[PDB]
């Protein structure tokens, strides 16, 4: 019965609360998408836009939760960009070993950080332990892999640069999300091991049935998503 514009009208408050709490670039992109929904002419157009809001907003709240920078997809660095700027002395041999798999160079994770446009973090190991802790405490599916040349041991007498590669998501099939993510990045990790480059890859996911205290984002942010985008999806179907 209800037209789409009227659906957006009814959820004015929830969406105004959502936009107010997202990081600035993330909020703007969601606001544009919301007006695409408001002015949508086809049900397929609205749903696709809602899908974009779901993923973009979730990433904004993942960033806030972790005190990380939200990066719009257009500004997200690729793997090749990370090797170029963080491990320049190995970039040429990175190119050679990617000749049979050149799409590796263009892999663009949600977050691509390095230890102190690649973002900097204070400790990679702390993030990994955070993820492994919540996986072990709350049963949350993750996948994790670290590169390792041969059977090399960690060392105490020198520091090396390292990368942390994180994939996040908001979607129903949580197990499938992390299984497919780690599978996609497995070849890169093996490659990194052969280059002597230390990397960790992390993947995790939430869905709308995850207990509110158990998400990878702060519970306050869970309510904002459920009160806005999640109802929007409900209301798009009914009407």
């Amino acid at each position: 019965k209800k037209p789409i514009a009227l659906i957006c009208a009814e959820l004015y408050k929830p969406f105004q609360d959502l936009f107010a709490a997202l990081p600035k670039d993330c909020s703007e992109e969601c606001q544009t998408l919301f007006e695409d929904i408001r002015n949508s002419e086809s049900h397929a157009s609205a749903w696709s836009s809602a899908l974009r809001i779901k993923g973009v907003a979730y990433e904004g709240f993942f960033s806030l939760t972790n005190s990380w920078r939200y990066i719009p997809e257009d500004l997200k660095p690729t793997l090749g960009m990370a090797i170029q700027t963080v491990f320049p002395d190995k970039f040429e041999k990175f190119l050679e070993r990617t000749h049979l798999h050149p799409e590796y160079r263009d892999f663009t994770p949600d977050y691509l950080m390095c230890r102190s446009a690649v973002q900097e973090v204070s400790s990679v190991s702390a993030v990994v332990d955070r993820f492994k802790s919540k996986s072990s405490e709350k049963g949350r599916p993750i996948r994790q892999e670290e590169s390792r040349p041969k059977t090399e041991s960690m060392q105490e007498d020198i520091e090396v640069d390292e990368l942390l590669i994180v994939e996040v998501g908001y979607q129903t099939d949580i197990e499938g999300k992390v299984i497919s993510d780690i599978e996609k990045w497995k070849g890169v990790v093996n490659l990194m091991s052969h280059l002597g480059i230390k990397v960790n890859v992390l993947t995790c996911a939430d869905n709308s049935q995850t207990p509110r205290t158990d998400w990878w984002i702060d519970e306050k942010y869970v309510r904002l998503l459920l009160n806005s985008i999640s109802y929007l999806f409900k209301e798009l179907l009914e009407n």
């Epitope: 190991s125 332990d129 040349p149 041969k150 059977t151 090399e152 041991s153 960690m154 060392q155 105490e156 007498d157 020198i158 090396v160 002597g196």
Partner: antibody, heavy 118, light 113 residues
Framework: EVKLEESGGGLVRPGGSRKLSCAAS????????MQWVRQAPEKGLEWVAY????????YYADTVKGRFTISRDNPKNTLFLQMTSLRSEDTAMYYC???????????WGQGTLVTVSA | QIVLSQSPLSLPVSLGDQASISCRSS???????????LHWYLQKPGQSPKLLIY???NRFSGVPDRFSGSGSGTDFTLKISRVEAEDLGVYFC?????????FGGGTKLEIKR
């Protein structure tokens, strides 16, 4: 003066358990990885286990995997080795050691003798 | 699971002569961080082992300067320029580039008489 002092050795029946301790002094224990090394009588040295400064990274010799647990208590400047399912082949002098800045064995205890026998 | 092969097994040497002990690795001990974790120890009779040389050629603080180390990759050598009576004992190389950490089998230095 850096010193490592092991305790807890003695006699255990096969299949049994024993916990060793190593008390460290003379350096900031909590900043450094710690290790166990053993030596069966009249034989060579055999590395046992490694634990990083903050317990994040642990390594074991394949012959002790699933049986021994290495751990530490940094406020108490103590390193531990929990041994279980002991076999006659585990009879040895057990040393704790550290690199005090590396994975080499720069400092060694006097050792504590574990005899596994009925 | 690097195998370290020491040679010779036993080394008789006259006081004041030089001694040379070889340690061969089954794979390279060059770590991706650029260091080579091959180390040398002496166990005197009835005593606990003692570090002589770490990372191929760094003499541990306080170790007599008659001890030196050299090598690269898979081939390493411990030298005693002038053997003293107190050098009696068993010499071990060991590696910590790879897990498990492994030891050579020991070289027994014997004082000739």
């Amino acid at each position: 003066e850096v010193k490592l002092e092991e305790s807890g050795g003695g006699l255990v029946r096969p299949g049994g358990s024993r916990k060793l301790s190593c008390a460290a002094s003379g350096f900031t224990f909590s900043s450094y990885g710690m290790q166990w090394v053993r030596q069966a009588p009249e034989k060579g040295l055999e590395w046992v286990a490694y634990i990083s400064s903050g317990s994040r990274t642990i390594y074991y010799a394949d012959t002790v995997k699933g049986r021994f647990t290495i751990s530490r208590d940094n406020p108490k400047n103590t390193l531990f080795l929990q041994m279980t399912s002991l076999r006659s082949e585990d009879t040895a002098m057990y040393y704790c050691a550290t690199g005090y800045g590396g994975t080499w064995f720069a400092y060694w205890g006097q050792g504590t003798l574990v005899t596994v026998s009925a | 699971q690097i195998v370290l092969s020491q040679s010779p097994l036993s080394l008789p040497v006259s006081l004041g002569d030089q001694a040379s002990i070889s340690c061969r690795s089954s794979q390279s001990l060059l770590h991706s961080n650029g260091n080579t974790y091959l180390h040398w120890y002496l166990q005197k009779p009835g005593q606990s082992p003692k570090l002589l040389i770490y990372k191929v050629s760094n003499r541990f603080s306080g170790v007599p300067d008659r001890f030196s180390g050299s090598g690269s990759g898979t081939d390493f050598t411990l030298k005693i320029s002038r053997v003293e009576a107190e050098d009696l004992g068993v010499y071990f190389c060991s590696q910590s580039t790879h897990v498990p950490y492994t030891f050579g089998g020991g070289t027994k230095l014997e004082i000739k008489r």
